């Protein structure tokens, strides 16, 4: 019968998941380890409600994350040919605020907490790695243009 596990186990389910196993293995040996409650509040429908809502907020997060990531993978129209000296110093040290002055409005919003670039924000006369992550799972790479104005 269907049983919900509240934390993660190696097989079956990962944290909040549902597995349809026989009465079998634990039951009175599952309750003590309370690793898989029969349902949430033991109610088939109530567990439905709870797990559904939780993973639903989770996948609406999934949706906004995908939006950000793909609008980036498809557009990435963030251009900065910032004047570069050459022999004298020249780099992408334009932090990111000037760089985000081209993200919202002209392109995807590209939330502030979503571009997890490091403290360098580019430091060469050449394009470097731009790290933007919509969530902790989606990995976004941006390599925008650079040059001398």
């Amino acid at each position: 019968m269907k049983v919900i596990l509240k934390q993660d186990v190696s097989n079956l389910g990962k944290r909040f998941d549902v597995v349809d196993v026989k009465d079998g293995y634990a039951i009175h040996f599952l309750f003590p380890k309370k690793l898989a409650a029969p349902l949430t509040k033991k109610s088939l429908q109530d567990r439905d409600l709870f797990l559904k809502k939780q993973q639903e907020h989770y996948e609406i997060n999934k949706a906004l994350s995908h939006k950000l990531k793909e609008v980036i993978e498809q557009t990435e129209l963030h251009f900065s040919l910032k004047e570069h000296n050459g022999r004298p110093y020249g780099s992408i040290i334009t932090k990111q605020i000037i760089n985000q002055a081209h993200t919202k409005g002209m392109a995807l919003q590209k939330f502030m907490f979503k571009d997890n670039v490091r403290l360098g924000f580019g430091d060469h006369e050449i394009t470097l790695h731009i790290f933007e992550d919509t969530t902790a799972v989606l990995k976004v790479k941006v390599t925008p243009d650079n040059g001398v104005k």
Binding site: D23, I27, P38, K42
Partner: protein, 64 residues
């Protein structure tokens, strides 16, 4: 005795029919088995219940 403690259903006396339909009195005993029923997280008595009552408790989430 061979009886439930939650309900009172007990043994059934009957006939032992064989070839030639010879009659000998026999007794069917209930499948008495030991179980522990929690009650408000306490008094986990080791009661002796039948398998049918065990199934009823199991489908009732151990409620009695």
């Amino acid at each position: 005795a061979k009886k439930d403690q939650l309900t009172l259903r007990g043994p059934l006396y009957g006939n032992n029919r064989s070839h030639s339909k010879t009659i000998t009195r026999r007794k069917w005993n209930v499948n008495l088995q030991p179980c522990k029923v929690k009650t408000a997280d306490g008094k986990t008595t080791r009661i002796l219940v039948s398998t049918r009552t065990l199934r009823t408790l199991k489908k009732h989430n151990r409620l009695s």
